[PDB]
């Protein structure tokens, strides 16, 4: 069926980066924009940013520019998110879900939504812990 | 970092009044006065320059104004 | 060989500027405050009150 | 950036209640929102998208509307499988805002 | 606030490499160049204006360049 | 009344100079290269030492 299933959860040092996995099964890879939401324990969830899995192309969130960079694998359909200069606020649970009218790149804002805008694929997350 | 475009160039002319205009309707005139209040043999120059072409005597005129706000400006 | 920075060109694309229009902010709705529009205008619908 | 204020923080209700949650944009979302109910730590449950329309596979109890920038979800009954984390989410301009959240508890 | 006395005006000669003159020497030609390529109708209105000028056929140039130097700078 | 500071003009007097000599200045002090100097010099106390 139309799932995203991601990779473990991650025990980090602060300064390092981690990386997050997230690959597609049921539908056509490179249709569906994936998106990343953290969210912390104590808080609600937190959109990350997007990547299209059809030529890379990234953008992200103003609280984390030069921070996360998002990466594909057309063969493995397979989304990579790492995250770069981690901090003990970085504690999190990161989702990654879909979002349609995926034709070409970027965002597609105007366009239509809805319908799993991203909220079908998610699976079952990955817990990040930034410790010593 | 010479910030060319002159936005004067595509100047929009609304019924308001633009981002500086009061201070730009006089702005290119004295910075040609205080050019040749600092140079003023070019003027004798330009003038030896204007008189050479033209001879026409209401053409050397024209080549004074050409040259004399060619020189603050464009130089 | 050394480098130099030019420094803040705040002022000069100020001066560059002379020409545009202002406007304003409101949240995310950009408010201008200048232009114009041509209208055709139905007066069909109108009533005195006080015949 | 628009921020989506979430109205109230935390509920509790009996069985079979109708309940209805607010969310509020500083700026104009039209119809740009979409809801969540979120179980503590698992694959969630499907709410609302475009902020007036169900899903299929979705049960009928749940609603939504809203047409400005006020967005009223509402569940006509509560039932004990409908304990969750309440979410909404922006979805103009791209700096995608989520809601602070409003949870329930069964009485 | 427009500050007029650009220094080239009175610029020192010496041995070293000036403040900015590897940037300096090419900035009023690319300046007239982006102000030709934006408005290049003014290049046929400038033809029609200085071939009515002086009748000398290679005058008329010299009132060309004259003209669409002036437009770029003083304007 | 639109009230504007008109900022910082660092960079429009940047561009301003493009005749201008960089020197350096430290307590004050101030060290100045590109300088020229006609110093004329004087032979017949020079001697080849030890020829």
């Known amino acids: 069926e139309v799932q995203l299933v991601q990779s473990g959860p991650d025990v980090e040092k602060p300064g390092a980066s981690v990386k997050v996995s997230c690959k597609a099964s049921?539908?056509?890879?490179?249709?569906?924009?994936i998106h990343w939401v953290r969210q912390a324990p104590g808080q609600g969830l937190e959109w990350m940013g997007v990547?299209?899995?059809?030529?890379?192309?990234?953008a992200s969130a103003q609280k984390f520019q030069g921070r996360i960079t998002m990466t594909r694998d057309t063969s493995t359909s397979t989304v990579y998110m790492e995250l770069s200069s981690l901090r003990s606020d970085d504690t999190a649970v990161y989702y990654c879900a879909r979002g349609g009218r995926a034709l070409f790149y970027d965002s597609y804002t105007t366009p239509r939504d809805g319908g799993s805008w991203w909220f079908d694929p998610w699976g079952q997350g990955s817990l990040v812990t930034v410790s010593s | 970092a010479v910030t060319l475009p002159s936005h004067s160039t595509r100047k929009l002319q609304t019924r308001s009044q633009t981002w500086l205009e009061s201070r730009e309707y006089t702005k290119h005139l004295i910075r040609v006065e205080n050019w040749i209040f600092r140079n003023p043999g070019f003027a004798l120059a330009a003038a030896a320059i204007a008189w050479l072409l033209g001879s026409s005597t209401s053409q050397k005129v024209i080549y004074l104004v050409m040259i004399l706000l060619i020189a603050p400006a464009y130089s | 060989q050394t480098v130099v920075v030019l420094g803040s060109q705040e002022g000069a694309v100020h001066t560059a500027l002379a020409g545009a229009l202002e406007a304003e902010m409101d949240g995310a709705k950009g408010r201008l405050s200048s232009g114009h529009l041509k209208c055709r205008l139905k007066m069909d619908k109108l009533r005195l009150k006080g015949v | 950036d628009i921020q989506l204020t979430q109205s109230p923080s935390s509920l509790s209700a009996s069985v079979g209640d109708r309940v209805t949650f607010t969310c509020q944009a500083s700026?104009?979302?039209?119809?740009?929102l979409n809801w969540y109910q979120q179980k503590p730590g698992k694959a969630p449950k499907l709410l609302i998208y475009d902020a007036s329309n169900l899903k299929t596979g979705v049960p009928s109890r749940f609603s939504g509307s809203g047409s400005g920038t006020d967005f009223t979800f509402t569940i006509s009954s509560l039932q004990p499988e409908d304990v969750a984390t309440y979410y909404c989410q922006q979805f103009d301009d791209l700096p995608i805002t989520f809601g602070q959240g409003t949870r329930l508890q069964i009485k | 606030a427009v500050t007029l006395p650009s220094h080239s005006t009175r610029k020192l000669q010496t041995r070293s490499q000036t403040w900015l003159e590897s940037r300096e020497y090419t900035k009023h030609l690319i300046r007239v160049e982006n102000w030709i390529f934006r408005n290049p109708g003014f290049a046929l209105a400038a033809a029609a204006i200085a071939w009515l000028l002086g009748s000398s056929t290679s005058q008329k140039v010299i009132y060309l360049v004259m003209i669409l130097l002036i437009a770029p700078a003083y304007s | 009344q639109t009230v504007v500071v008109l900022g910082s003009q660092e960079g429009a007097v940047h561009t301003a100079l493009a005749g201008a000599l960089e020197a350096e200045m430290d307590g004050a002090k101030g060290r100045l290269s590109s300088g020229h100097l006609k110093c004329r010099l004087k032979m017949d106390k020079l001697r080849l030492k030890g020829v």
């Open positions: 990547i299209n899995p059809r030529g890379g192309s990234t």
């Open positions: 049921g539908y056509t890879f490179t249709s569906n924009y």
């Open positions: 700026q104009d979302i039209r119809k740009y």
